[PDB]
Enzyme design. Sequence first.
Site, PDB file in Angstrom:
ATOM      1  N   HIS A 152      88.791   3.514  32.832  1.00 32.44           N
ATOM      2  CA  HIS A 152      88.822   3.975  34.228  1.00 32.44           C
ATOM      3  C   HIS A 152      89.274   2.903  35.227  1.00 32.44           C
ATOM      4  O   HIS A 152      90.055   3.209  36.131  1.00 32.44           O
ATOM      5  CB  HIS A 152      87.477   4.571  34.655  1.00 32.44           C
ATOM      6  CG  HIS A 152      87.103   5.813  33.909  1.00 32.44           C
ATOM      7  ND1 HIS A 152      87.838   6.975  33.986  1.00 32.44           N
ATOM      8  CD2 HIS A 152      86.069   6.075  33.075  1.00 32.44           C
ATOM      9  CE1 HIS A 152      87.275   7.900  33.230  1.00 32.44           C
ATOM     10  NE2 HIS A 152      86.200   7.379  32.666  1.00 32.44           N
TER      11      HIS A 152
ATOM     12  N   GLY B 222      71.363  15.524  33.254  1.00 31.22           N
ATOM     13  CA  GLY B 222      70.989  15.268  31.870  1.00 31.22           C
ATOM     14  C   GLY B 222      69.504  15.437  31.628  1.00 31.22           C
ATOM     15  O   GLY B 222      69.103  16.092  30.668  1.00 31.22           O
TER      16      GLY B 222
ATOM     17  N   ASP C  91      59.565   9.999  45.194  1.00 33.07           N
ATOM     18  CA  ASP C  91      58.597  11.036  44.839  1.00 33.07           C
ATOM     19  C   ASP C  91      59.301  12.266  44.263  1.00 33.07           C
ATOM     20  O   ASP C  91      58.939  13.404  44.573  1.00 33.07           O
ATOM     21  CB  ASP C  91      57.734  11.411  46.051  1.00 33.07           C
ATOM     22  CG  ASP C  91      56.921  10.240  46.580  1.00 33.07           C
ATOM     23  OD1 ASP C  91      56.028   9.741  45.862  1.00 33.07           O
ATOM     24  OD2 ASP C  91      57.173   9.820  47.727  1.00 33.07           O
ATOM     25  N   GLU C  92      60.304  12.024  43.422  1.00 33.23           N
ATOM     26  CA  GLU C  92      61.091  13.090  42.802  1.00 33.23           C
ATOM     27  C   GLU C  92      60.252  13.958  41.865  1.00 33.23           C
ATOM     28  O   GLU C  92      60.399  15.184  41.848  1.00 33.23           O
ATOM     29  CB  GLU C  92      62.284  12.502  42.045  1.00 33.23           C
ATOM     30  CG  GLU C  92      63.313  13.522  41.596  1.00 33.23           C
ATOM     31  CD  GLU C  92      64.526  12.876  40.965  1.00 33.23           C
ATOM     32  OE1 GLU C  92      64.369  12.220  39.914  1.00 33.23           O
ATOM     33  OE2 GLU C  92      65.637  13.031  41.516  1.00 33.23           O
TER      34      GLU C  92
ATOM     35  N   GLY D 240      65.608  12.447  36.531  1.00 32.17           N
ATOM     36  CA  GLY D 240      65.557  13.820  37.034  1.00 32.17           C
ATOM     37  C   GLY D 240      66.927  14.331  37.437  1.00 32.17           C
ATOM     38  O   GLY D 240      67.053  15.081  38.408  1.00 32.17           O
TER      39      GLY D 240
ATOM     40  N   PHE E 232      62.253   7.761  40.758  1.00 30.37           N
ATOM     41  CA  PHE E 232      63.026   7.877  41.989  1.00 30.37           C
ATOM     42  C   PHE E 232      62.149   8.428  43.101  1.00 30.37           C
ATOM     43  O   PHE E 232      61.974   9.643  43.227  1.00 30.37           O
ATOM     44  CB  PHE E 232      64.281   8.737  41.784  1.00 30.37           C
ATOM     45  CG  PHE E 232      65.247   8.700  42.942  1.00 30.37           C
ATOM     46  CD1 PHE E 232      65.470   7.523  43.653  1.00 30.37           C
ATOM     47  CD2 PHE E 232      65.952   9.838  43.309  1.00 30.37           C
ATOM     48  CE1 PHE E 232      66.363   7.487  44.718  1.00 30.37           C
ATOM     49  CE2 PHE E 232      66.851   9.812  44.374  1.00 30.37           C
ATOM     50  CZ  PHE E 232      67.056   8.634  45.078  1.00 30.37           C
TER      51      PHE E 232
ATOM     52  N   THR F 226      77.857   8.648  24.829  1.00 30.16           N
ATOM     53  CA  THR F 226      77.976   9.391  26.086  1.00 30.16           C
ATOM     54  C   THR F 226      76.930  10.513  26.104  1.00 30.16           C
ATOM     55  O   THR F 226      76.192  10.688  25.129  1.00 30.16           O
ATOM     56  CB  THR F 226      79.419   9.944  26.303  1.00 30.16           C
ATOM     57  OG1 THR F 226      79.590  10.337  27.669  1.00 30.16           O
ATOM     58  CG2 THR F 226      79.717  11.129  25.378  1.00 30.16           C
TER      59      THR F 226
END
Length: 403
Positions: A211, A12, A36-37, A9, A34, A142
């Site tokens: 990175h 993306g 209660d998303e 959620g 996730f 990506t």
Amino acid sequence: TVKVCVCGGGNGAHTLSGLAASRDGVEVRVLTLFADEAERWTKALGADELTVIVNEKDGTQTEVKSRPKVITKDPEIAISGADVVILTVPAFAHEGYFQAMAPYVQDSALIVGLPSQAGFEFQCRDILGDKAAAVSMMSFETLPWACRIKEFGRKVEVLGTKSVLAASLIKGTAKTVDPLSTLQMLHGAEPVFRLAKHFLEMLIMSYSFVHPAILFGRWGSWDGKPVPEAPLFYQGIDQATADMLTACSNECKDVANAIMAACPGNDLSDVKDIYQWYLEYYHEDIQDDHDLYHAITTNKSYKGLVHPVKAVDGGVAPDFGNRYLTEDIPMGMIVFKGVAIAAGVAIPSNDKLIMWAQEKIGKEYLVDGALTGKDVATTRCPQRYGFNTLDAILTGKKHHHHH
Ligand SMILES: NC(=O)c1ccc[n+]([C@@H]2O[C@H](COP(=O)([O-])OP(=O)(O)OC[C@H]3O[C@@H](n4cnc5c(N)ncnc54)[C@H](O)[C@@H]3O)[C@@H](O)[C@H]2O)c1
Ligand SMILES: NC(=[NH2+])NCCC[C@H](N)C(=O)O
């Protein structure tokens, strides 16, 4: 009807759900584990349409509106009868989704990692068990868009869309919907999707060292004294870092060559130099391109980008509580390392980066060139899942002996 399941959620997941739910002949089920998303989304959306604002190359803003069939936390509703299952979340969250889909996923399913990161296929194999040989696993390099949520559960903005995007495919025994054309159809005109040659090609072409190298190049032997403002990220690299990047890119080619030698029929010839990649994809942005140092420092699409910093005594200091290291190492470099271990190739430059960077995030992964750190169980390296040899890495089949 194409039945598509979107996992997560986030930015993306919002962007993908809106665009996919607008295509005629597509039913979209959104699954988020996730907390209660899922409920929070449904409640925020109400009866309104999920709006995707696309910033086009003209300067104009196209507006896409659609409603997914269901946004639930119940993996049974979301997965059952799904032809395509797409995971769009940070990698630490992938373990949960594979477990959730395990009992309800069908043989003919196409499982997609958008993006996969590294060790996606090793993890999928381990959790789905035998079923991984039936399904098809698809790994994107990506996320297709640079996107941010404007209003949770109802509005997301595409800052821009990639023109080209590569995905690797592991074909299972079951016949799926056509991987390339179906994914293109959901995405629209852009990006134009192409199939990569091999999944391990995709795995190493992540360049998981980048990175961690830029952060080591600036803060490696940092004395503790603050700096005025946040130093430039990509463009703030010294020569020592361009040499650090090349050495890790050379080590990528080393592992790629060992695998092709040990197991012929595995085409990994599309693995490049990072200097070669830059001059192929950033050609329109680089002012001076004679070496890797100049290709990165004079790259226009890197301007204004700085290091993560926090306020301290007499200036700013590097913020390390980021996903530059807590993601790119356990879900990137360590996977590459395990693959390199199995390939029988030493990767000293990569090793130096792992050791420093794990210590900054208070984690242990690599110990004396062995995958034996405390948190080695939170990584997606193939040895963690039992796949210790190169053959086990390619096929997912483990050696059992008689007689
Ligand atoms: N957003 C971009 O434009 C951008 C660009 C290129 C690549 N990416 C990469 O793509 C990936 C996905 O991007 P995004 O912006 O959608 O990520 P995100 O930060 O928006 O993801 C958050 C979502 O992940 C799930 N999640 C977060 N923490 C969780 C946890 N504790 N347990 C279970 N689920 C949890 C939730 O569903 C949440 O809504 C990222 O890994 C990112 O590195 C992002
Ligand atoms: N998909 C790739 N080949 N990426 C290579 C560059 C990757 C690097 N970590 C970046 O964001 O610049």
